[PDB]
């Protein structure tokens, strides 16, 4: 039942060692937990700790991120199941390093072969291998929406104009999904199509940090990976098996129209911790989109990201509390 949580915790960076920050985290993989020292200069022995389901130090990197969180959702994704996995932090941790990752400097990597590559790149293009020695005809579908002061916007739109809206409706075929009005989807033929409509999408969201303030930080990216996997049975019957794997970059959580998501997500956790009854999921765009992943049939996780230095003590907490809070969600997964 229980969605599953975990933590990473970014290096430091470069102006933090050129401002002397100390480190307050301390990750153990194998008992799992993380463990924040909380006293600075007046109690030294101080901290606080908590458990995860899995947790990854400063030195993680991002195949291991890939092997140990995404291989187990990826298989299950193969079985037909609908999976969510989101990132939630404050500005600067690393959600979308982990999410999309980076490009490493000097077209020195094949983009498949970048260490730099996040969970989005090497799930697609792991989806190619698991599924051509197989033979088992397959289709694949992307899509890439962003939330930004509750419009919608469509980053792999024909559209050259980043401004023009999505709009969102109740799905009649599924009680706890929606239908994106006008959303993009592209069939990917083959690993070769991948990077260039990436590429696309990355170049429609760099205008679009140009016409928003504080895009980056404000939005919610959703991007989708839909499968349609044809299997014959033992008396020869034809059956379709699909599978969905929603990947969500959110909104910096050091925010809190403009914050609406990111509130409301906040309020749907608690009400479903605390077995309150009528959950707020139609308050807001990201919930209703997000809605079967808490609490419903989709199987999630979540990735706590954090920073360890002593200057975000009380942001690093924070995402703690609140991610460890939501291991309390009990979703009921189920087959397509
Ligand atoms: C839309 C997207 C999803 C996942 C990764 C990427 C990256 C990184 C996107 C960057 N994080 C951003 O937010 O703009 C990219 C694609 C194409 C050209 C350059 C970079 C990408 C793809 C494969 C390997 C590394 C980075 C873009
Ligand atoms: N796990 C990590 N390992 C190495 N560098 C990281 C890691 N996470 C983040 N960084 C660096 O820190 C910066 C912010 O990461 P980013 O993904 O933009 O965080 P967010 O999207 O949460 O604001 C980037 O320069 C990124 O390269
Ligand atoms: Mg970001």
């Not at 409706?169 to 999904?177: L, S």
């Not at 994106?180 to 990077?195: A, P």
Request: glycine content about 6%; charged content about 25%; overall charge negative.
């Amino acid at each position: 039942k229980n969605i599953q949580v975990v933590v990473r915790c970014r290096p430091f960076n470069l102006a933090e060692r050129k401002a002397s920050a100390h480190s307050i985290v301390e990750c153990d993989p194998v008992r799992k937990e993380v463990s924040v020292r909380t006293g600075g200069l007046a109690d030294k022995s101080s901290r606080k700790t908590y458990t995860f389901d899995m947790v990854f130090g400063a030195s993680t990197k991002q195949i291991d991120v890939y092997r140990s969180v995404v291989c187990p959702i990826l298989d299950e994704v193969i079985m037909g199941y609908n999976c969510t996995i989101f990132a939630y932090g404050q500005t600067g941790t690393g959600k979308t390093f982990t999410m999309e990752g980076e490009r490493s400097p000097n077209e020195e990597y094949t983009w498949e072969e970048d260490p730099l590559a996040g969970i989005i790149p090497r799930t697609l293009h792991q989806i190619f291998e698991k599924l051509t020695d197989n033979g088992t005809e397959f289709s694949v579908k992307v899509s890439l929406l962003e939330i930004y002061n509750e419009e919608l916007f469509d980053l792999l739109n024909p559209s050259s104009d980043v401004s023009e809206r999505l709009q969102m409706f109740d799905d009649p075929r599924n009680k706890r999904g929606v239908i994106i009005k006008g959303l993009e989807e592209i069939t990917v033929h083959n690993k070769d199509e991948v990077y260039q409509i990436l590429e696309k999408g990355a170049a429609k969201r760099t205008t679009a940090a140009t016409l928003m303030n504080a895009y980056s930080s404000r939005s919610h990216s959703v991007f989708s990976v839909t499968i349609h996997m044809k299997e014959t049975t033992i008396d020869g019957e034809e059956l379709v098996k699909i599978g969905k794997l929603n990947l969500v970059d959110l909104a910096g959580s050091e925010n809190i129209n403009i914050n609406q998501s990111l509130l409301t997500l906040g309020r749907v956790i608690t009400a479903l911790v605390e077995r309150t009854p009528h959950v707020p999921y139609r308050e807001s765009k990201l919930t209703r989109i997000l809605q079967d992943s808490l609490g419903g049939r989709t199987r999630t996780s979540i990735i706590a990201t954090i920073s360890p230095a002593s200057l975000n003590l009380e942001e690093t907490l924070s995402t703690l509390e609140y991610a460890h809070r939501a291991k309390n969600i009990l979703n009921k997964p189920e087959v397509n």
